[PDB]
């Protein structure tokens, strides 16, 4: 440097000519760069992650005019960012899906390329319709030729997915076993995703490809509301589907000191699985809710079966003074909590 590259001015490495990356990794001058122009070379056929071996914040990469034809799903793995990728005027027969893996790439130039249209390009298909990566204007067409951004459409799809929960209910300390059936034709990788099951003993690897077996043993109540997801990746794209478990345990309940806000409110917190049905008592007898005295639930919080709310009293008087009892019932039985409330002194 200078010898065959490094001109530009800012964070740019410019080598618009024959390949010479053999020593541009050992002692190039700066692993940092932002633009790489390689729109001209004689070699470059197999582009792998090694060819990019070098941490860098690059936003523009030009590999048009070259010889590349097989880009294995990995490559740009390094450059976390990347907004514009120009691979135009090359030999690349097809560009694997996984390549982009949502890198926020804003512009992707693929063209004058053989671009044999396969199912393994439905993704660029989408990208054209959806008008995402600035694919539209380019007017891409197929090699051999069955010409272009037209294309059999229904004959390419993502894999299908159903996951069978145990048909019977569940109770704490059981074994919950289940399979994830991926039904399609592309057929590549698969594997579950556990969103932190620190409270249960999971047992996977019980499957190959037609099905993936996952079993949770000696199951704690802390399984509730924890998505249990599974993978699927055809030759073009990915589908994840996720289900849940629902382990049951007895009702618990508590009431808080009545508080006057816009309306009066007797706050309550109730848990239990199955979720319990609620009923109130006023001085030991059934309290029928009205438009002025009724139960109101706050919005359920993220992954926690506990519910909060109030017995709301719209302008209650001294005739409403008394003992309020909340009864939470489920299969296991019933929990109860009482509290005295005075809303106004009597005459």
């Amino acid at each position: 440097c200078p010898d065959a590259c490094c001109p530009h001015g800012s964070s740019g490495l410019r080598c618009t000519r024959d390949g010479a990356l053999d020593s541009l990794h050992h002692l190039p001058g700066a692993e940092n760069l932002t633009e790489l122009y390689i729109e001209n070379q004689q070699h470059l056929q197999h582009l792998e992650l090694r060819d990019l071996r070098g941490l860098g914040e690059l936003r523009n990469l030009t590999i048009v005019k070259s010889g590349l034809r097989f880009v294995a799903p990995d490559a740009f793995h390094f450059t976390p960012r990347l907004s514009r990728l120009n691979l135009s005027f090359n030999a690349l027969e097809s560009l694997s899906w996984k390549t982009v893996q949502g890198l926020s790439l804003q512009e992707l130039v693929l063209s004058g390329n053989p671009l044999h249209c396969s199912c393994a390009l439905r993704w660029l298909q989408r990208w054209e319709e959806e008008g995402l990566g600035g694919v539209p204007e380019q007017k891409l067409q197929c090699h051999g030729q069955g010409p272009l951004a037209h294309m059999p459409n229904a004959s390419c799809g993502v894999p299908t997915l159903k996951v069978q929960v145990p048909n019977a209910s569940v109770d704490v300390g059981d074994d919950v076993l289940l399979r994830c059936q991926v039904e399609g034709r592309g057929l590549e990788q698969a594997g579950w995703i556990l969103t932190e099951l620190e409270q249960s003993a999971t047992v996977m690897k019980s499957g190959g490809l037609p099905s993936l077996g996952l079993t949770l043993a000696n199951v704690t109540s802390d399984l509730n509301r924890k998505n249990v997801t599974c993978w699927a990746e055809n030759d073009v794209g990915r589908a994840e589907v996720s289900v849940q478990v629902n382990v049951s345990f007895p009702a618990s309940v508590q009431l808080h000191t009545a508080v006057e806000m816009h309306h009066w409110c007797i706050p309550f917190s109730v848990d239990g699985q199955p979720a319990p049905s609620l009923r109130w008592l006023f001085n030991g007898s059934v309290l029928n809710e009205t438009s002025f005295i009724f139960t109101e639930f706050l919005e359920p919080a993220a992954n926690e079966t506990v519910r909060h709310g109030c017995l709301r009293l719209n302008q209650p008087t001294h005739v409403n003074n008394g003992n309020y009892t909340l009864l939470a019932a489920n299969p296991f039985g019933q929990a109860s909590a009482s509290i005295m409330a005075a809303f106004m002194d009597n005459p």
């Binding site: 508080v259 806000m261 816009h262 309306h263 706050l298 709310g309 106004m344 005459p347």
Partner: protein
Amino acid sequence: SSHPIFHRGEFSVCDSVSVWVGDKTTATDIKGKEVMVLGEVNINNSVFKQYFFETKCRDGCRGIDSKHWNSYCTTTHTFVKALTMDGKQAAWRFIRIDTACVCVLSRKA
């Protein structure tokens, strides 16, 4: 006081208090005249002690954009029939009594 409702609940812009008023002796009628309020009344042979449901400010309002507005809470009224006195005239007249506490808005600058 760690209950979610203390945070996600529906609050009043102005806080009030409600009480039964039974010692009321004077009041002002629909004409704005200071009249006497009796303590009992005879509704169909049934002697009644005169009582009133009154709501008043709990002594700027909550949630107001104080950058742009001056504001305060104040007690508003309602008119209710009551056995009163104007001379030797015990009558069934409407009087002014506390019924709510509202927020009064006022532009600043």
